[PDB]
């Protein structure tokens with residue numbers, strides 16, 4: 287009925303010995319996009335050209351972690367458990383209120399239209415292109431008491447060449463072609479979903495460095511050739527070759543059982559403006575050209591933080607493109623001069639297992655040495671996976687995405703979003719929503735032309751998302767106290783992680799999940 | 807104003823031909839287009855490109 | 868000399884796409900031919916005209 | 929073949945050298961696709977289904 291609420295606002299976290307369940311609700315506003323029509327989209331810009339469509343529909347996105355975890359909760363989670371992975375989810379939209387706007391002259395009036403319908407469907411079948419997954423605004427806001435605007439749905443189409451235009455292959459997906467539920471106030475929508483078994487994300491830092499796992503005290507039983515000649519001078523000395531049983535201490539020489547990492551090199555820049563070479567953002571030598579990129583169908587796509595690699599700590603004066611950058615509290619606009627106002631994610635913790643972003647993978651003999659010809663070593667920058675390699679994935683972040691859909695392709699290797707998160711073949715479905723059109727008074731004599739005059743409307747209501755996370759406690763045997771993340775903030779005039787006098791809420795730092803320790 | 811919904815159940819019969827050589831079939835074959843065919847455009851307008859019949863498959867007398 | 872007979876049972880999966888605009892499909896499209904294609908000819912010779920793949924249908928990532 | 933006898937085989941050419949044997953036996957091979965699909969059939973298959981994979985086989989001479 288019109289008079290009855292169709293759902294209660296509950297946001298909660300319930301913790302278990304084995305599983306924690308998060309639940310949060312938010313209020314949303316839904317405009318009328320593109321005055322009700324699908325629009326072709328395309329621009330051709332050389333290293334950017336793209337093509338696609340913009341839709342009258344909007345969608346709900348809960349892909350950021352902070353959507354379901356209050357800071358404290360996130361804390362609880364990461365200081366206590368080694369791994370976590372999502373198990374099941376369920377969503378419900380309710381208290382739909384459709385508003386109609388009179389828009390008188392000078393003043394715009396708004397009043398409820400009780401008999402109006404907003405339509406929601408979610409598609410399981412994954413027939414619509416998935417977009418919820420990468421790098422984008424629209425997720426519910428972290429702070430509960432913040433109303434948000436449902437994002438408009440638009441999708442990309444395959445672009446052939448450096449020039450944007452469409453081939454027969456390009457396709458059009460029309461949301462109205464799908465069956466969807468129609469609601470009015472007093473109507474509600476609900477759906478459930480079960481995640482697929484997925485590797486627990488590792489929420490620990492290695493307490494051992496891969497290269498040396500051996501017993502410091504003993505020495506291998508293998509021998510290596512130590513020197514072709516005597517002395518410490520490169521090209522002089524007595525001819526004889528000498529072999530020696532690998533002894534305790536010459537660890538760098540120990541034959542090991544594993545190779546540390548897959549790797550792609552990244553350019554490095556210094557946070558101090560002064561240190562960098564001059565590089566423009568446009569023109570023949572715009573930065574893009576010098577930053578590690580992957581050429582695809584004639585178009586440079588700059589590699590996103592790439593195959594997981596070690597990166598300078600957050601405080602460090604140098605930073606690489608490999609690390610993710612978050613706004614930070616103080617920044618006002620879209621652009622800023624000093625990087626002291628930004629937040630940098632860093633994977634120092636990964637260093638124990640795999641190569642550094644700005645440094646190389648290693649160096650290989652790139653030549654066959656000989657008495658008359660000197661040995662030459664080649665610098666290796668790109669290294670595909672090799673038998674016996676072991677690496678760590680990029681960590682997840684409080685404000686980082688949670689899942690991402692694994693491309694529907696013949697081949698994929700070690701799916702783990704590179705931006706961080708769990709790779710799913712069938713990820714939480716995008717739930718679409720749109721305000722049904724309505725018509726302005728219409729002409730008395732019939733005209734075939736499609737109607738174009740519509741009443742102005744917008745809707746609002748609350749959505750509630752609940753996720754059941756499966757986690758695993760630590761159970762370590764380490765004796766010395768671990769590192770844990772605790773605020774440690776100095777005396778503050780207006781406390782952190784809280785709304786302020788203005789009433790504004792902003793997240794102070796970016797937070798990872800690897801504080802606990804574990805050995806290899 | 808309101809919505810109407812129409813559902814029709816069509817009975818069809820597959821081909822089952824013994825012809826060896828590949829048939830003609832209707833496929834778009836449209837050239838590179840600035841704004842793809844059979845789809846809404848930037849203006850947001852939708853219009854049908856060609857008139858289409860139903861006789862592409864072959865059968866003998 | 869003798870005959871051999873081979874039978875294979877293939878498992879296939881229909882498309883089930885939600886794309887609106889007509890797909891590309893492979894249809895002959897051959898021009899008027901003096902001796903039709905994909906068929907034996909006056910000499911009595913049989914030869915395949917083009918090499919044919921299997922990817923004509925579309926699907927998103 | 930080979931008047932009934934197995935023969936050693938080898939040539940040494942620098943980027944080709946090879947070694948092996950030639951047998952009096954012969955074998956049946958149905959590894960090309962067109963062996964089991966008439967053009968039309970191949971057409972039917974590819975314009976309608978997303979994927980395919982072989983399930984079982986049986987032969988008789």
Ligand SMILES: Nc1ncnc2c1ncn2[C@H]1C[C@H](O)[C@@H](COP(=O)(O)O)O1
Nearest residue numbers: 484485699700701702703707708709710
């Ligand atoms: N996040 C995520 N989603 C899906 N699949 C993933 C993920 N991380 C790793 N993998 C895959 C990569 C290999 O297919 C497999 C190896 O199992 P392992 O047990 O890791 O040796 O696990």
